Design a protein around this ligand. Structure first.
Ligand SMILES: *[C@@H]1O[C@H](CO)[C@@H](O[C@@H]2O[C@H](CO)[C@@H](O[C@@H]3O[C@H](CO)[C@@H](O)[C@H](O)[C@@H]3O)[C@H](O)[C@H]2NC(C)=O)[C@H](O)[C@H]1NC(C)=O
Ligand SMILES: *[C@@H]1O[C@H](CO)[C@@H](O)[C@H](O)[C@H]1NC(C)=O
Ligand SMILES: *[C@@H]1O[C@H](CO)[C@@H](O)[C@H](O)[C@H]1NC(C)=O
Ligand SMILES: *[C@@H]1O[C@H](CO)[C@@H](O)[C@H](O)[C@H]1NC(C)=O
Ligand SMILES: [Ca+2]
Ligand SMILES: [Ca+2]
Ligand SMILES: [Ca+2]
Ligand SMILES: [Ca+2]
Ligand SMILES: [Ca+2]
Ligand SMILES: [Ca+2]
Ligand SMILES: [Ca+2]
Ligand SMILES: [Ca+2]
Lengths: 275, 486, 25, 123, 48, 39, 271
């Protein structure tokens, strides 16, 4: 009950000062998320310790820097648990992974509120532009069937799964947007892949997605009309992972000056599960 | 919290009549009863691109019993009571099918159909005569015309199938039913001998609409296959909905409630616009009246009038008499039309503002709410009688005052002189009772005109003081709203 | 607004023929 | 005109109130019912589905335009469904400045007099 | 059975009522209005 | 109120409609209606 | 419509003929026999160059051949901004020609009809049922309130009273206020319930044959010769086209711009 209604009065003259303190941990924690390809190319295994030593001179105490290895973009998109405070995610760009990278960026860079979806028993809808559905698991073959006012499937027969429309097939992660205001019947392989009704709150500003490779393709906003460039949608140019990591360490002061530690959650899950 | 869902479908209804026969003894010439009987039927048909399986049950009502009996001789032909259907008789065809719509048929907001008529014609029955010329039943026909759909249920062997019942009317047709080779010609109507004419099925086609009320506790997430059937539904506890209704007063407003209370509320004005099912919108009003009759307040009205009638031929001391005549005044308030603001106005306003924002979920429960509020709302109230600018005020708890109109200072009370006038002079509900009125005059010094108006409980002056944002009247009316707690 | 209680009491006679519907049916 | 629009809405509401309540005036709906009864009685073409769907019309379209009054302390405030609005002294008929806010306040509580004989005719 | 009749409708009959209005007086419509017509009274005298 | 007594009110109204008084009231109302119809 | 206040002394404006010719389009619908008798096919270019002299820019004139009157009656789309329909007349085509003229000259507001289920009435004098298709054979049967047909059996279709047979287009009026059950060949012919609004300013019908026989209004009494029902005698289609070209000022003057907020999108040949 932090009194989020009474106004706060500032002043436009006095004074530029310091931030006093905050006592819940000794200090912040930086947190790299790199693919296995970095380790394989580096061909080492004292390199995490070397990078910690090289962070120490930049001014991070030893215990603050953590490293997390993931198989690749698609295998990491499933339940991306950001166990940490200042998250960087080095995403190697690869052609045909454009929408997968956009999915992961839209998932972690923004703060989501997800409810369960019991597909077998209910139809489902979308409240507004801010409401997506997020399907995750080993294999998500999300076949939808929209229904008119009369509960007759338009372009599909509700009793014949074949007639359905496959919005996204065989994805580790799929953010699906169907038209807002029309009931749908969903069908996906509930043994492997789960699905959730996820509304989009404001942005999550612990996380910085560093596109390691090509052009600027991360379209976080599903709206085709908008395509903003966020300060955390980082992009760097690479030939070698050692060069990438060295740039990160060298410029880490700016990397954390663009983010903000405040927007953090108890659980490491990338969304608030509101049941 | 309860969402409308349209389920309108085009269906083909196939059905066949059922024939029962009972033989009479002797050598096999007579018959005892030829009558229609309930008949089931199964089928499948293609519609909307899927094969839907349907189950129908036909039954007949209003049937005539013609007769024919050749005499007491042991071989003369006859049928003791052979039936027919004609103008009066109806035929019901309960219909069911596996489609999704019939799973969501528990709660319905509306339901009506458009079916195309059909012509049913009687077959040929050769009455089993052992020897001689063969008698011949033939002819007879009617036409089924649809009139009204309702809910129903097949008591099928494996389960009870909730279903739609189509009540078709009848219309006798051209072929004159006869008992050929026998003394009955140029009748008209469809007899029970062979109503199907050997047809595999009589067929109807139409479109039926339906507006179900599948529940919802969240906008995005609407169900299919309504499975909260009256096995899965049970009596909401009396204290539980009492607490719900008491909680609902969290939100009621101050001036808007008085604005509503200054309407004439009638049967149609209140009980219309209730988000209810078909089975409860049919008789909600009568259901409310049935339990309103037996309420303690209503039987008190009855006892008052009967006691007065019996008296017509039979021929803190003050607190008790004042309390008894206070109860009597409450009864008089309810029965008659008072020209004041009339506490029961506020009670009905609170009642409407409460029930409008609720829902009927398979049980009426306006009985036990309307009738209960009618007796419990505003437990302690007050009345007054003005005479010679010395208004005498009385409380149902037994208290009494007598104060001047021009200036609000009390006087010694006059028992048996208040009682002579309370019988005839019009009683004024004291929604601005003496205590609050004295506070108002002391703090916000008022004039003769508005003093008289507030004494009379004039809506104009009451709303003027409310819209002045007068704290005294505001708080008083707020407590008035707050005693409405069932 | 109090008119509805008077209307209920006055029109309550029809509950007799309504229960007649119920029991005859 | 904001005043005319507001008074038109209030006039529609007042027509509904006239239908709902029991007024001691002539009550235009009264004349509508009388004319309906006379027409029904004299007319000799009344099927099963005529009195239904003509009593409704006699409620709807009979006297589409009408006016109402609020009496108050030697003055009168009259309103019309079309949009007209006057206010005049009750002893001598000479109109005085109108107050739409006062009228909207008073219309909800005070009784309304169906102006069968409206101020255009009183003058 | 019966073809009981056909029955005039609003569309066919509103012009008849238009042409029927002009016979209506006014000195006694006031009396008829003043008399309170209940459910019994209004439909008591339909075509006898 | 011996045992499931019938509707007293509607039973009495069943032939309070046909009383001399009620017939006279309807007669007067229809007379005024005819007077309205024909001047 | 909001009021519009104008004086009676304002000076008349200038001629708007040049502006309307530059901004609008003209489109002629003629039968195939026209081209057949012309025995040519540079003639569209020739007539376009001819119109250009009077002042219709080169692309503004559209020649949309139709096979014949009855076959054109089905779904007449007038892909233009000023429409002329040359309409040859032969005896026994009187009613269908009049039907087409009524259909296009009069504006309509139409809704679908579901013959299979509902019994349909007619709202009043401005309401008709228009049936269009390769072959329409409507068979109507009126009913009582008890759904017992008069002059027909509601279940048997033979008893039904045919009102049009084997017609590409049929505008049927029936007795207003009586429920009917209809039987029309749902695969072939589509029937719609239409109301006749005011006139269509956009279309003019140039009858080419005989007497002033068109009766647009189904009412027997009124047979008013509206201005857009033009007529001309003929022996040579070339003479007919030259007449239309030379007097095209008068024809478009008789017509006028279409003023209706439509609700059915369709292709138009506008500029
Ligand atoms: C209006 O009336 C015509 C007049 O007959 C109707 O024609 C009927 O159309 C139905 C189907 O549209 C035909 O049904 C057929 O039944 C046979 C079995 O006997 C079946 O093998 C066929 O596949 C078909 O279902 C029917 O035969 C035909 N009438 C006659 C005499 O042949 C027309 O359908 C009616 N319009 C509407 C909308 O109902
Ligand atoms: C604020 O931080 C700076 C860091 O350079 C420090 O030098 C300064 O003393 C701090 N402010 C105060 C008031 O001490
Ligand atoms: C999804 O589809 C498959 C085959 O298309 C089907 O076997 C399965 O039952 C469907 N899932 C649900 C929940 O119905
Ligand atoms: C209208 O015509 C007159 C006479 O030819 C001419 O003087 C005037 O300029 C014209 N107006 C316009 C707007 O061209
Ligand atoms: Ca994906
Ligand atoms: Ca499909
Ligand atoms: Ca969406
Ligand atoms: Ca975008
Ligand atoms: Ca016939
Ligand atoms: Ca035709
Ligand atoms: Ca017509
Ligand atoms: Ca005509």
């Amino acid at each position: 009950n932090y009194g989020l209604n009474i106004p706060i009065t500032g002043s436009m003259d006095t004074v530029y000062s310091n931030s006093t303190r905050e006592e819940v941990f000794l200090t912040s924690t930086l947190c790299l998320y790199y693919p296995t390809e970095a380790s394989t190319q580096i061909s080492d295994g004292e390199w995490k310790d070397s990078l910690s030593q090289m962070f120490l001179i930049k001014g991070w105490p030893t215990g603050s820097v953590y490293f997390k290895e993931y198989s690749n973009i698609v295998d990491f998109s499933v339940d991306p648990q950001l166990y940490c405070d200042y998250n960087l995610v080095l995403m190697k760009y690869d052609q045909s992974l454009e929408l997968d990278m956009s999915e992961l960026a839209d998932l972690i860079l923004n703060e989501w509120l997800c409810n369960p979806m019991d597909i077998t028993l209910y139809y489902y809808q979308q409240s507004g532009e801010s409401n997506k559905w997020i399907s995750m698991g080993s294999s998500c073959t999300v076949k939808v069937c929209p229904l008119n006012t009369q509960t007759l499937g338009i372009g599909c027969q509700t009793t014949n799964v074949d007639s359905f429309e496959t919005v996204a097939e065989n994805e580790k992660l799929a953010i699906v947007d169907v038209v807002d205001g029309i009931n749908h019947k969903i069908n996906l392989t509930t043994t492997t892949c789960t699905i959730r009704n996820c509304k989009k709150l404001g942005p999550r500003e612990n996380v910085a997605v560093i596109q390691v490779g090509g052009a600027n393709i991360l379209d976080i906003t599903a709206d085709p009309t908008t395509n903003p460039q966020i300060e955390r949608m980082m992009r760097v140019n690479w030939k070698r992972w050692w060069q990438v990591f060295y740039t990160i360490v060298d410029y880490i002061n700016q990397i954390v000056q663009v983010m903000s530690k405040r927007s953090r959650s108890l659980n490491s899950a990338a969304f608030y599960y509101r049941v | 919290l309860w969402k409308e869902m349209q389920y309108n479908r085009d269906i083909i209804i196939r059905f066949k009549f059922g024939n029962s026969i009972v033989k009479m003894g002797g050598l096999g010439y007579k018959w005892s009863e030829i009558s229609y009987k309930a008949a089931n039927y199964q089928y499948n048909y293609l519609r909307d691109g899927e094969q839907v399986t349907a189950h129908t049950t036909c039954s007949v009502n209003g049937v005539n019993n013609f007769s024919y009996n050749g005499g007491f001789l042991p071989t003369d032909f006859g049928i003791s009571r052979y039936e027919v259907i004609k103008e009066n008789s109806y035929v019901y065809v309960d219909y069911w099918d596996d489609s999704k719509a019939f799973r969501n048929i528990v709660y319905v907001r509306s339901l009506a159909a458009n079916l195309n008529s059909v012509r049913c014609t009687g077959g040929s029955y050769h009455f089993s005569l052992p020897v001689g010329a063969w008698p011949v039943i033939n002819g007879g026909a009617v036409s089924l015309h649809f009139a009204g759909v309702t809910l129903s249920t097949q008591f099928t062997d494996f389960v009870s199938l909730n279903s739609l019942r189509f009540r078709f009317s009848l219309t006798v047709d051209e072929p004159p039913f006869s008992i050929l080779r026998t003394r009955t010609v140029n009748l008209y109507g469809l007899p029970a001998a062979n109503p199907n004419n050997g047809n595999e099925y009589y067929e109807i086609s139409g479109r039926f609409s339906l507006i179900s009320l599948v529940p919802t506790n969240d906008d995005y997430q609407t169900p299919i296959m309504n499975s909260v059937t009256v096995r899965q539904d049970l009596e909401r506890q009396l204290t539980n909905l009492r607490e719900e209704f008491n909680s609902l007063s969290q939100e009621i407003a101050m001036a808007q409630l008085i604005d509503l209370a200054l309407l004439p509320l009638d049967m149609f004005s209140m009980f219309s616009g209730i988000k209810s099912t078909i089975d409860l919108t049919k008789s909600m009003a009568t259901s409310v009246m049935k339990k309103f009759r037996k309420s303690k307040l209503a039987t008190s009205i009855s006892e008052m009038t009967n006691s007065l009638s019996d008296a017509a031929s039979s021929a803190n001391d003050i607190s008790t008499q004042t309390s008894t005549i206070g109860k009597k005044l409450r009864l008089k308030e309810m029965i008659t039309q008072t020209e004041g603001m009339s506490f029961d106005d506020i009670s009905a306003a609170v009642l409407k503002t409460k029930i409008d924002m609720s829902t009927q979920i398979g049980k009426n429960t306006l009985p036990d709410i309307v009738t209960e509020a009618s007796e419990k709302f505003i437990p302690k109230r007050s009345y007054r009688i003005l005479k010679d600018d010395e208004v005498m005020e009385i409380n149902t708890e037994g208290k009494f005052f007598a104060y001047k109109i021009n200036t609000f200072d009390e006087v010694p009370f006059d028992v048996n002189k208040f009682a002579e006038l309370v019988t005839d002079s019009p009683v004024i509900s004291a929604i601005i009772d003496f205590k609050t009125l004295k506070n108002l005059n002391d703090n916000y010094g008022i004039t003769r005109t508005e003093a008289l108006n507030l004494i009379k409980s004039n809506p104009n002056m009451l709303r003027n003081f409310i819209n002045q944002n007068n704290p005294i009247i505001r708080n008083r009316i707020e407590q008035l709203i707050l005693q409405c707690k069932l | 607004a109090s008119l509805i209680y008077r209307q209920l009491l006055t029109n309550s006679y029809s509950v007799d023929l309504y229960d007649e519907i119920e029991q005859i049916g």
